[PDB]
Design a protein around this ligand. Structure first.
Ligand SMILES: NCCCNC(=O)c1n[nH]c2c1CCc1n[nH]c(Nc3cccc(F)c3)c1-2
Length: 309
């Protein structure tokens, strides 16, 4: 009976992830695939409120989109953009490591998401390959804003008790993509803590001089000597082969609304377009937010803006 409300809107499928859990599901009104993050309230908690509040406020081409927050006596449900491509983590593992060229393709997407997160006044604080998914177009989507304002990924000053720390974590990520293993690792947490504080890591033979130089700028122990996010957007390495800076500004507006989506919702709601717009622009992350955003996603995927009434 904890699933009663949910089953009004979505048809559930197989659980894909466990231990929060994650279920694949279909949104009935649009027919769009989603992923539903299911969390127990008793067996847990403000970590969830943190995240939900973050995702309500963040909207971006490289952030896994929150469509819908449902809450029951026992459960909390988060209906999220469906990323069939799987984790960045598993993809590195299959390839062993990424080429510099492929690392750059991926890394630009990470910078874009993180630069935007910082622009909105947040720090992610838990950046790692497990927190990055590929959508059906092999585009990166950032997840899990629960620790936002993994020891392997933590900046020295964070460990010692905000946006500088993210730059450091992006550095570790950069290293992992190109190397296939951590720059700092150890069985023992305090030994790891010490390696991180010292800041010395193996520099593998296959890294280009330009890779090594970027790594060295991002992985500065002193946060004040560390490349800033602004300077990362147009770093020589980042610009290689692209010749334009990372486009970090969000498409996916809060203010501009899609006319076709407004129209189809208007006919469902049997109201006029101005009423429908005011209603959408409250962004309450109820079924309306879900349906609007899912109609928009239907449209981007080149499908007709159509509800199933
Ligand atoms: N720090 C640990 C993070 C916990 N993991 C997730 O929340 C999570 N893992 N995987 C997902 C999510 C939420 C959004 C999300 N959308 N699509 C997928 N996963 C997915 C994975 C494989 C096939 C597929 F169709 C979907 C997810």
């Amino acid at each position: 009976k904890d699933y009663d409300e949910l089953l009004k809107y979505y048809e559930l499928h197989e659980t894909i992830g466990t231990g929060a859990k994650v279920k694949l599901a279909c949104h009935i009104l649009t027919g769009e695939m989603v992923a539903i993050k299911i969390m127990d309230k008793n067996t847990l908690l403000p970590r969830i409120k943190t995240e939900i509040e973050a995702l309500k406020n963040l909207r971006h081409q490289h952030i896994c989109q929150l469509y819908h927050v449902l809450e029951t006596a026992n459960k909390i449900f988060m209906v999220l953009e469906y990323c069939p491509g799987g984790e960045l983590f598993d993809y590195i593992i299959s390839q062993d490591r990424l080429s510099e060229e492929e690392t750059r393709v991926v890394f630009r997407q990470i910078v874009s998401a993180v630069a935007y997160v910082h622009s909105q006044g947040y720090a992610h604080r838990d950046l790692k390959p497990e927190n990055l998914l590929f959508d059906e177009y092999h585009k990166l989507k950032l997840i899990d804003f629960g620790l936002c304002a993994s020891l392997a990924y933590a900046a020295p000053e964070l460990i010692q008790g905000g946006s500088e720390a993210d730059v450091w974590s992006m550095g570790i990520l950069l290293y992992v993509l190109m190397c296939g293993f951590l720059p700092f690792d150890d069985d023992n947490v305090m030994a790891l803590y010490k390696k991180i504080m010292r800041g010395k890591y193996d520099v593998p033979k296959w890294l280009s001089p330009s890779s090594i130089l970027l790594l060295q700028q991002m992985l500065q122990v002193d946060p004040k000597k560390r490349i800033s996010m602004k300077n990362l957007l147009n770093h020589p390495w980042i610009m290689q082969d692209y010749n334009y800076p990372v486009e970090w500004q969000s498409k996916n507006p809060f203010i501009h609304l899609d006319d076709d989506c407004v129209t189809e919702l208007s006919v469902h709601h049997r109201n006029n377009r101005q009423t429908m717009e005011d209603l959408i622009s409250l962004w309450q992350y109820d079924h309306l937010t879900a349906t609007y955003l899912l109609l928009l996603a239907k449209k981007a995927r080149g499908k007709p803006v159509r509800l199933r009434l």
